[PDB]
Amino acid sequence: CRAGPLQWLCEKYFG
């Protein structure tokens, strides 16, 4: 996932 503010959130939850 793109390194946005929700990088951690995107990778951990949204794949």
PDB file of C-alpha atoms in Angstrom:
ATOM      1  CA  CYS A   1       0.000   0.000   0.000  1.00  0.00           C
ATOM      2  CA  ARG A   2       1.039   3.648  -0.583  1.00  0.00           C
ATOM      3  CA  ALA A   3       2.994   5.259   2.280  1.00  0.00           C
ATOM      4  CA  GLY A   4       0.203   7.626   3.398  1.00  0.00           C
ATOM      5  CA  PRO A   5      -0.636   8.779   6.964  1.00  0.00           C
ATOM      6  CA  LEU A   6      -2.641   5.513   7.179  1.00  0.00           C
ATOM      7  CA  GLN A   7       0.250   3.383   5.802  1.00  0.00           C
ATOM      8  CA  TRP A   8       0.238   1.211   8.954  1.00  0.00           C
ATOM      9  CA  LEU A   9      -3.585   0.992   8.894  1.00  0.00           C
ATOM     10  CA  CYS A  10      -3.740   0.140   5.163  1.00  0.00           C
ATOM     11  CA  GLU A  11      -1.152  -2.671   5.401  1.00  0.00           C
ATOM     12  CA  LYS A  12      -2.251  -4.095   8.781  1.00  0.00           C
ATOM     13  CA  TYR A  13      -6.035  -4.098   8.111  1.00  0.00           C
ATOM     14  CA  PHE A  14      -6.680  -3.366   4.401  1.00  0.00           C
ATOM     15  CA  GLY A  15      -4.113  -5.872   3.006  1.00  0.00           C
TER      16      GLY A  15
END
